[PDB]
Design a protein around this ligand. Structure first.
Ligand SMILES: [Cl-]
Ligand SMILES: [Cl-]
Ligand SMILES: [Cl-]
Ligand SMILES: [Mg+2]
Ligand SMILES: [Mg+2]
Ligand SMILES: [Mg+2]
Ligand SMILES: [Mg+2]
Ligand SMILES: [Mg+2]
Ligand code: NA
Lengths: 79, 216
């Protein structure tokens, strides 16, 4: 299928680009992100233009396109 | 024995996919007799964060890497000593000969250089070439007379100025894993693929400092 490049921005201004398949559950993205960042899956929430991303949302379902940005926030105060 | 006389037994075998190569044994590594003992090093954290290891391991697990992960360890120079980035040309050159000899014997799929510094030294003393515009990742040259690839990653030592935290370096461990899988024909889940990592240096340094202050 087709893929798009998404930019995931954290509160430390770190920006991580991922090539993602349009029809895949973003659970994989969130999981990949949390592990590479070294934090629990439940310690972060991922937002796409105001909408929180569910594990079973896909880029196509959310209307995401090339270069779109996903913002990540902590569920709890600084470590 | 006094610390500067100690050496660090390498961990090598045949059929390895990866051999982590540093300049020489770090002080804590030589002291404890294990590779990359933290907290002044990000190797073990990056190893888990990139998915190269199934669980979070530490230096005391180094012996299990060949068998369970196809990963081994050695260094350019066996002599322990700080300021190893500026050892003599002759010591580096001789260490390089010995290193290439071991690589030609064990034939690991990928020689992974822990930092641009060591690869620059290796290229100069082994290839006889001062590399220009050295990039991280895969290099075009193989270990002399072998099919062993050369892969360069950011130094795992916490002293690395360009990348303050483990998360600022893990990107290349992830890319190394992707390459490794490719070589072994391991099915790669192309649904998600990390292609780039950029960050704010100053906020990273400050973050690294804070976490370092938090006593567990
Ligand atoms: Cl000493
Ligand atoms: Cl450790
Ligand atoms: Cl480096
Ligand atoms: Mg869909
Ligand atoms: Mg579905
Ligand atoms: Mg739009
Ligand atoms: Mg090593
Ligand atoms: Mg990184
Ligand atoms: Na969810």
């Amino acid at each position: 299928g087709e893929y798009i490049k998404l930019k995931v921005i954290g509160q430390d201004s770190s920006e991580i680009h991922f090539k993602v398949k349009m029809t895949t559950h973003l659970k994989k993205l969130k999981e990949s992100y949390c592990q590479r960042q070294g934090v629990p899956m439940n310690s972060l929430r991922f937002l796409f233009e105001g909408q929180r991303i569910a594990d079973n949302h896909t880029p196509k379902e959310l209307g995401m396109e090339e270069e779109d940005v996903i913002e990540v926030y902590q569920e709890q105060t600084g470590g | 024995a006094e610390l500067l006389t100690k050496t660090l037994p390498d961990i090598l075998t045949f059929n390895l996919d990866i051999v982590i190569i540093g300049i020489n044994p770090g002080l804590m590594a030589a002291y404890k007799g294990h590779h990359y003992p933290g907290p002044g090093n990000h190797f073990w954290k990056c190893l888990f964060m990139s998915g190269l290891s199934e669980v979070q391991l530490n230096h005391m697990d180094d012996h299990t890497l060949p068998g369970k992960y196809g990963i081994g360890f050695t260094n350019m120079v066996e002599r322990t000593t700080p300021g190893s980035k500026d050892l003599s040309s002759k010591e580096f050159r001789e260490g390089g000969r010995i290193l290439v000899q071991k690589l030609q014997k064990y034939q690991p799929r990928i020689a992974v250089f822990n930092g641009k510094c060591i690869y620059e030294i290796f290229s100069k003393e082994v290839f006889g070439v001062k590399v220009k515009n050295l990039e991280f990742g895969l290099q075009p040259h193989k270990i002399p007379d072998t099919e062993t690839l050369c892969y360069v990653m950011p130094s795992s030592s916490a002293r690395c100025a360009q990348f303050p935290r483990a998360q600022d370096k893990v990107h290349y461990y992830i890319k190394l894993k992707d390459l490794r899988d490719q070589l072994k024909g391991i099915e790669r889940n192309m649904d998600v693929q990390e292609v780039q990592y950029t960050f704010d240096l100053q906020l990273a340094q400050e973050d690294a400092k804070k976490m370092a202050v938090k006593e567990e």
